[PDB]
Amino acid sequence: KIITDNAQRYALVNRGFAIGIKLLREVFDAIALNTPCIFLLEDIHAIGERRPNGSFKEDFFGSQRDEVHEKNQVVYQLTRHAITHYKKPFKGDYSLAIPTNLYVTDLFLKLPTQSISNLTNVENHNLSIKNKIQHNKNSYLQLTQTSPFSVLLLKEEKRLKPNKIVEELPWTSLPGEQLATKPRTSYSVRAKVAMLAELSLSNLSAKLDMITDLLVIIDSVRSNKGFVVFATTDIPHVLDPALRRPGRLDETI
Amino acid sequence: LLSFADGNILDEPPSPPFSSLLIPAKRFENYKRFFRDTLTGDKMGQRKSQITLLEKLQYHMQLRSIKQLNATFSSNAALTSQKLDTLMSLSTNNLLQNPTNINWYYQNRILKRHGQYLTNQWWNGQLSEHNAETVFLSDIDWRSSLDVLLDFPDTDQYYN
Amino acid sequence: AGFTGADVMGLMARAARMAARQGRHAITEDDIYAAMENKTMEATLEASTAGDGGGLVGGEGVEGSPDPIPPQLRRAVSVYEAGKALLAYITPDYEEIARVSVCPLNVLTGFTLFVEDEDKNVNAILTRSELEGRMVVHLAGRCAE
Amino acid sequence: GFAVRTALGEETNFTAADIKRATRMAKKYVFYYGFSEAGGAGITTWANQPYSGDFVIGQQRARKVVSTDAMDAFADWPTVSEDFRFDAPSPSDVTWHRYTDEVRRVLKG
């Protein structure tokens, strides 16, 4: 007999409280009652992504909230680790602190990167400066092809678009009332940037570290007997090295 | 894997995803304004930013309506509206022949600009505090002498 | 170096599996070294081979991976690993060699396992002679090929 | 770092942690405070003033105040209001050459 369930059905968090992450241990200790059985669990990266050093803080804001000795020790160990832990078992692994791992990744996955261009008004390559806050055919000749109308056209009309330039007021602004018929983020740069920043910060603030109890419940299933657990994934390199350690999830297929 | 920092500003600090500071984005916005106004335009093919066909039609409609008001209440109509909305359907065809761009300059650099005159230009550096940033954040105000109002400007931003 | 209790118990399990793969029941120390090498190479090929890309395995039968790994491509790997180990031996005060190997997990690279002492430079020191010796050892393989 | 090198007779990565610190200070010597002779007097057409830590998404530790690196930041006066910040135009890579050459002269002396 086989039991199958998906992991996305348990990444439900609200108020920084992950409800499903104990629903999962409850279903685990229920699996532990119907031996012998196979338990499938797919897309585990949904509950297994990397829990989040920076020199940009002492460069521009000047915090320097650290004794010089601990910083010096960090520098020593960082250099030695970058240079001498290349391809050493359990000391040198899925580690972003080593540049040669990133070189290998970009060598096999990506396609050949090119040099800089000889143009002007571009950055280094044939492109423009990129946004500060992140929110088959041969020619172009084959690429030129009451309630609902009003409501949803004006619904598409007012949404915040990040790639719109910004309008400019006449130095003698629109008279009173008319200024209130205009969405503020369409003629004011301060307003548009404030809105984008609030969006970005809010969408980042949804971290809610859940790795530790997932780890303890994974360690929980070796005290049982007579069943097996398959955890299928798609991006095994973006998983946090807390799981890939021997005893948790290392037998790979 | 070594970048040599070619076209950009020398020391720029991070942005809201990382640092909650909003100055680099405020300057990027004006960079994009400059790109649209001077180098590229709104679409492929245009010489610069242009007065759209919709805006021309709207000037026409406003003048017509004010004229009909001033003539009817102080005293060849439906055909006009019909064929006028006929043209309105084009609009998105890139290949319309527009011979001149003087109206864009007259409407955007003369009527929105140097027709007028902004009078808050500069200030002497010696204020009641050691700064304009401190004078502005002060608790009362320091911009009142007849008790005229003596304003100091905001700082100018350079983005090169 | 750098292992703990969980590491060594998982190592014993993977070592038993590696000893099975050679038709034995008793775990030898060679099976432990093979387990270390296996973990390392699997980790590196999981990072290289991902959603697509790939191009590093050599035993899958798919259009990517030829089945027997032609002989002219085995002579080269052996020459590579031999040059690297030879240069790491004649270099004064380099690390010590524990196990040289070719074609681990069928990938087309070698693997030399180095035993090093954590008490000559306590996880923190790098002298100039050591860095120059490392540079020479890392160019030796290409130069011998 | 220079003491370790003069005892052993050979370079190390200890220097790696020294010069980093020194470089920061040396730049603050040349650009922000105006002590050098970069121009005939030491006045330079561009400097990078610090921002307050209030902008960073910050945390709090139970530590003591650092001896030098954080007690010398009592003399800085960062910028706190965003619409009164001054950044001059960046230099021209022929002027940056000469300014960073002044940084080098300081460090070498």
């Binding site: - | 070594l2 040599f4 920092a5 | 540079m135 | 890579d93 050459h97």
Partner: peptide, 29 residues
């Protein structure tokens, strides 16, 4: 997290010299 790991804002004539020195180290090795 094109892909770059290191950045540097040094002048072009100093970049010349530093890269020449890296190259001669590699030649000797």
């Amino acid at each position: 997290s094109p892909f770059y790991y290191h950045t540097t804002d040094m002048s072009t004539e100093q970049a010349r010299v530093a890269l020449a020195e890296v190259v001669e180290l590699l030649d000797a090795a």
